[PDB]
Structure formats: structure tokens, C-alpha cells
From a paper:
RNF125 is a small protein (25 kD) that contains, in addition to the RING domain, three zinc fingers (ZnFs) and a ubiquitin interacting motif (UIM). Using mutational analysis, activity based assays, NMR and X-ray crystallography, we have demonstrated the essential role of a C2HC ZnF for the interaction of RNF125 with the E2, which originates from the requirement of the C2HC ZnF for the structural stability of the RING domain. Collectively, our experiments show that the RING and C2HC ZnF domains with their linker regions act as a functional unit held together by interdomain contacts.
However, the structure of the truncated RNF125stop129 was solved at a resolution of 1.55 Å. RNF125stop129 shows a compact module in which the RING domain and the C2HC ZnF are easily discerned. The predicted unstructured N-terminal 30 amino acids were not observed in the electron density. The C2HC ZnF adopts a ββα fold, typical for ZnF domains, which is capped on both sides by α-helices formed by regions Li1 and Li2120-128. The α-helix of Li2120-128 is almost continuous with that of the C2HC ZnF, but is kinked at C119. As expected, C100, C103, H115 and C119 coordinate the Zn atom. Interestingly, the structure demonstrates that extensive intramolecular interactions take place between the RING domain and the C2HC ZnF. Specifically, electrostatic interactions can be observed between C57 coordinating the proximal Zn2+ of the RING domain and R113 in the C2HC ZnF, where R113 makes additional hydrophobic contacts with H45 in the RING domain. Furthermore, a hydrophobic patch is formed between V43 in the RING, and L109/M112 in the C2HC ZnF. Additionally, an anchor between the RING and Li2120-128 is provided by a strong hydrogen bond (2.6 Å) between E42 Oε2 and the hydroxyl group of Tyr122.
Author numbering: 33 to 128
Write the structure that this text describes.
């Protein structure tokens, strides 16, 4: 599915595309590179940088809605991170 992150598996937040064509949350690939420099955490390809903002994916996420996995509220994908931040059922299940 075009809208999940290949490291955390949640709906993408600020999607970034790496030179190898993998798409991750900006913070997810930033933290991966902090620990294991110059490597894609999904396919292990050489990365000279975090990548570029996946503005095609960000655009499409504005016109997509999906149910939160934990409370079933229909949420816009662009706003899903903000939803799970304060979703009590999510917090119940995964912790703060
Ligand atoms: Cl709803
Ligand atoms: Zn992520
Ligand atoms: Zn990759
Ligand atoms: Zn929820």
C-alpha cells in the first residue's frame, strides 16, 4: 500500500523517498541514518542523503481517508499521525 512506511508500518508522516525508491516517514529515515549511515533500512542500498520529500505521495494523501485501526474513526491520511497521537484506543494498545 502506497501510504505506509517501510520502517514503522504506520501511515506515512511527511513521506520521503530515497534514491532507491523506498518511501518512509521523514523522522523514520532520519533516525535510521543516524544509526546506520548511508544505507537504506529496507533494501540496504547506498544512500548519499535522506532522499527527497515525496510530494506526489503527500498530495495523494490529502484525498484519501481510512479508518483508524484502533478506534475505527475515518481519518484523512494526511492527518493520521495527528489522529493516533491522541487516539486513546491507540494509546491503550501501544503505550504512550
Ligand atoms: Cl468518522
Ligand atoms: Zn515511519
Ligand atoms: Zn531502499
Ligand atoms: Zn483512532
Amino acid at each position: 500500500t502506497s501510504f505506509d512506511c517501510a520502517v514503522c508500518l504506520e501511515v506515512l508522516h511527511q513521506p520521503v523517498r530515497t534514491r532507491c525508491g523506498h518511501v518512509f516517514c521523514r523522522s523514520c529515515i532520519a533516525t535510521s541514518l543516524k544509526n546506520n549511515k548511508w544505507t537504506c533500512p529496507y533494501c540496504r542500498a547506498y544512500l548519499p542523503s535522506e532522499g527527497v520529500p515525496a510530494t506526489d505521495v503527500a498530495k495523494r494523501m490529502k484525498s484519501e481517508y481510512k479508518n483508524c485501526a484502533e478506534c475505527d474513526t475515518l481519518v484523512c491520511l494526511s492527518e493520521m499521525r495527528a489522529h493516533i497521537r491522541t487516539c486513546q484506543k491507540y494509546i491503550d494498545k501501544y503505550g504512550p
